[PDB]
């Protein structure tokens, strides 16, 4: 358990780091968010299985559901920005500077 939790926390940390520093494509940022979602779900799953707490196993599934809903919203926003600018580049998202 301890080593697994350490590596999983490091994985979430790396995915958060990847989200915080961009790299042009918004789709990649969405994927990094989705990876953090994966890591958090795994954390919860292993914690519950370790503790034999079967009343908290309803909660990782809720995590997945809500993360899926937000990911769908993100994809729709990607579609709209693409319709606006021709690409998904985050550079174009600079109008509101003024």
């Amino acid at each position: 358990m301890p080593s697994t939790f350490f590596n999983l926390t490091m994985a979430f940390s790396l995915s958060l780091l990847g989200t915080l520093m961009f790299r042009s494509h918004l789709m990649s940022t969405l994927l990094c968010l989705e990876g953090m979602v994966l890591s958090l779900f795994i954390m919860t799953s292993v914690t519950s299985l370790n503790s034999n707490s079967m009343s908290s196993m309803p909660i990782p599934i809720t995590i997945l559901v809500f993360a899926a809903c937000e990911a769908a919203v993100g994809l729709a926003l990607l579609v709209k920005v693409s319709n606006t600018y021709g690409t998904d580049y985050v550079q174009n998202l600079n109008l509101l500077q003024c």
Binding site: T9, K80, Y85
Partner: protein, 344 residues
């Protein structure tokens, strides 16, 4: 939007925060946060203009990152204490990360660069929701964990945001961005007094909401969105100038107006707790707010700006837009100090 979408979307925006403040479980508070986040975005992107889409994307990315950080805090607290609520024994880093991520959600500095842009992009009638209704949930999450927060971190964020909002207000000509910066400053006060006595944090939240909503409806009246544009109310709608002046001054926080009561009471509590340096600095820097509100007052009410030929037809045509709630909130926000003891 068709009626059924309006019903469902507005109902979900209303539901999210209610779940957050009526949930005993951290995962359910997170569910409320996600409800608000998901449901607001379609209202933001309702216009479907290039600026609107970009504002919605900025909001989405920032809020999603904040929610994930909060969820990490929840999961680690679970790993530690086998429960879904923060306890006195909970690791300090978990609470630090929660405060940090809820700060990002709230828009507090130095995570504040996102709020001005989104507010500028989005229309006024949704700017009101963004700067009023969407703060209740995160601040509730903090208030439910107030005894465990970190005084150093909270005071640092609060003073940072006071300074940043005050400085940012000056430069901006846009009303939407000005109201965003005012939001930042008032939230700075709210969080400054949160760890010591959350009742006054809630008092400040109430008064700020009761002052911002009237101002946002005032802007909606003529869709004003710039200093120059609002300068034409002496011609388009003279009646409102008096209350607009009073309300801007109150938000600034002059004594006779209500706006004093939040700042004065918060300074009093901080002094009781021996927070003299931070209290002094915050009070001092809360005067740039009065400056960049007084500029607006000068532009609108005390001086008469040049008008256009075509405003004559605006004069000719009739108007039926100001609500009863405008008058109620405006008076009850700018003429209530003598009832202050009952408020606190």
């Amino acid at each position: 939007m068709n009626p059924i979408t309006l019903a469902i979307i507005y109902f979900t925006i209303f539901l999210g925060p209610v779940i957050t403040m009526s949930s005993t479980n951290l995962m359910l508070m997170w569910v409320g946060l996600e409800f608000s986040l998901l449901a607001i975005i379609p209202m933001l992107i309702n216009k479907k203009n290039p600026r609107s889409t970009e504002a919605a994307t900025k909001y989405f990315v920032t809020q999603a990152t904040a929610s994930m950080i909060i969820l990490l805090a929840i999961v680690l607290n679970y790993k530690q204490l086998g429960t879904w609520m923060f306890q006195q024994q909970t690791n300090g880093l978990i609470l630090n990360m929660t405060l940090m991520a809820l700060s990002m959600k709230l828009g507090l500095a130095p995570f504040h660069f996102w709020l001005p842009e989104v507010t500028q992009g989005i229309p006024l009638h949704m700017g009101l929701i963004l700067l009023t209704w969407q703060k209740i949930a995160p601040l509730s999450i903090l208030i439910q964990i107030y005894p465990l927060l970190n005084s150093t971190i909270i005071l640092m964020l609060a003073i940072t945001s006071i300074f940043m909002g005050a400085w940012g207000g000056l430069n901006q000509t846009q009303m939407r961005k000005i109201m965003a910066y005012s939001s930042i400053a008032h939230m700075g006060w709210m969080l400054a007094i949160l760890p010591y006595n959350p009742s006054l944090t809630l008092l400040n939240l109430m008064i700020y909401i009761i002052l911002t909503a009237p101002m946002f409806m005032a802007l909606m009246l003529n869709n004003s969105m710039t200093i120059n544009s609002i300068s034409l109310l002496w011609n388009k709608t003279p009646a409102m100038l008096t209350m607009i002046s009073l309300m801007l001054l109150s938000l600034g926080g002059l004594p006779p107006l209500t706006g004093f009561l939040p700042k004065w009471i918060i300074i009093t509590e901080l002094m009781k707790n021996n927070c003299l340096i931070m209290a002094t600095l915050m009070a001092m820097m809360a005067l740039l707010n009065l400056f960049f509100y007084t500029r607006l007052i000068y532009s609108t009410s005390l001086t008469m700006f040049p008008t256009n030929n075509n405003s004559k037809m605006m004069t000719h045509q009739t108007k039926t837009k100001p609500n009863l709630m405008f008058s109620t909130l405006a008076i009850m926000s700018t003429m209530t100090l003598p009832l202050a003891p009952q408020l606190i």
